A and B are shown apart, each in its own frame.
Chain A
Amino acid sequence: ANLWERFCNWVTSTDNRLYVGWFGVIMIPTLLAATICFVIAFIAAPPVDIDGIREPVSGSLLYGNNIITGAVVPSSNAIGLHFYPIWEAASLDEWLYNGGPYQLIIFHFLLGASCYMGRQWELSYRLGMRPWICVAYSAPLASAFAVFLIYPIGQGSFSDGMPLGISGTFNFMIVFQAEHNILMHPFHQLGVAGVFGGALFCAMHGSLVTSSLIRETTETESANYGYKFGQEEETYNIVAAHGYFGRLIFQYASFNNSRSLHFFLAAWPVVGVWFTALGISTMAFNLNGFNFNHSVIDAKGNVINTWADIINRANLGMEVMHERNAHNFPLDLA
C-alpha cells in the first residue's frame, strides 16, 4: 500500500496491455528518443560531412532524397570515436553538419534494444515461462551492435558505422566487401547458411504442418477456422507429417518429436546469425576473408587466375572508388 511498492507493482504488472518492467523503464525513454530523432532527421536533417573532408552528403527527404536513397548519415570522421552530444557543439547547426543525430540515435537504440532483450527475459519470469526467447533475440541484437558499434571501434570512426538508410546500407556492404572480402569469410558463409537455411526450414515446417491439418472445415471456409485459440488438442497430424517427410527423404532424416523439431528451428538461424555477427565483429579487427589472390601459378610462375582472382578485380574497383576524395596516401589502412 506504500507509494514505492505500488509503483513497483504497476511497473511489473502482468495486466498492462504492454508490459513495462524495469528493463522497460530504460527502454521506453531511449527508444522514444531514438525514434523521434530518427524520424525528424530522416525528413529534415541538412547534409552531413560523413568523411570529415568537408564534403557533406545529403540524406534527408527535404534535401532531395527519396525513401530509397535517404539516410541518417554517420557522424564526421573528424570526430572519430569521440562522444559528440548536443551540448558539446557550439550550436545545433554545428551538431547537424557534423552528424550528431547519428550518435544520439544509435546510442539510444542500442541501449533500448538491449533493454528490449532483458524485457523479454523479465515478462517470461512474470508469466512462469521458460526464459530463453531472449537468447534467440541476442542474435539480431548482436548483429546491430556489430555494424553500429563494434566495427567503428575497431576502425576508429562512427563514420564507418553502418548508415541508417536503405542505400546507405548498400554503401556499407560494398565497402565492407572491398576492405575485408567478407564473401570469402567463413563466418559470413555461416550467416548465409543460417539465413537461407532459416527460410528453408520456415517454408518446410509451415508447409508440413499445413499439409497435415485435420479436416475440421468445408471447402467454402478458411481451413484456419478449424483451430480455436486455446483448444487443448493439436490441430495437425504430426505422424502423417512425419510419414510424408520421412518418405520424401528417408525415415531417419525426419523429426517425430515436435520438441526436438522446434528447438532445431530455433537454433539453426540463431547460431548462423551469431556467427555472421561474429564475422562483422572480427573483421572489425581486420581479420579478413580468405585471400587466394595468385595462389595458382604454373611451372614457369605465370599466374593462373581462379574465380578468387576475378572477385579480387571487383574488390579492387570498389576500393579505388570508395570515398574518392578522402585518401591522400596509398594504403587504406582503416
Chain B
Amino acid sequence: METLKITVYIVVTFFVLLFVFGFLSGDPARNPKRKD
C-alpha cells in the first residue's frame, strides 16, 4: 500500500509540475496573432 501511495504521490507531482512549468513557459506568446 505504501509503495502504491509513494507511486501516486510521484505521478501526481510530476503532472502538476508539467502544468505549472508549461504555463510558465511564455504561454501568452503561443497564439496565432501577437506574441509576447
Contact = CB atoms under 8 A, between A and B. Distances in A.
Q: Which secondary structure dominates chain A's binding surface?
A: helix
A117 to B, nearest CB: 15
Interface in B1-36: 1-2, 4-5, 8, 11, 15-16, 18-19, 22-23, 25, 27, 30-33
A26 to B, nearest CB: 6
A22 interface: yes
Interface in A10-54: 11-12, 22-23, 25-26, 29
A5 B24 CA distance: 12
A87 B2 contact: yes
A29 B8 CA distance: 12
Contact of A29 (B15, B30, B31, B33): B15
Nearest to B30: A12
Interface stretch (A122-130, A156-164, A290-298): A122-130
A4 B15 contact: no
Interface residues of A, number: 18
A112 to B, nearest CB: 11
A22 B15 CA distance: 10
B16 A26 contact: yes
Contacts of A5: 25
Contacts of B16: 26
Interface string A123-156: 0011110000000000000000000000000000
Contact of B31 (A4, A25, A87, A128): A128
A86 B30 contact: no
A4 B1 contact: no
Contacts of B1: 86-87, 89
A105 to B, nearest CB: 15
A86 B4 contact: yes
A22 B19 contact: yes
B32 A128 contact: yes
A22 B31 contact: no
A85 interface: yes
Contacts of B2: 87
Nearest to B16: A26
B23 A22 contact: yes
Interface of B: 1-2, 4-5, 8, 11, 15-16, 18-19, 22-23, 25, 27, 30-33
Given A5-B25, A128-B33, 7 more contacts: A22-B22, A22-B23, A22-B27, A85-B5, A86-B1, A89-B1, A125-B30
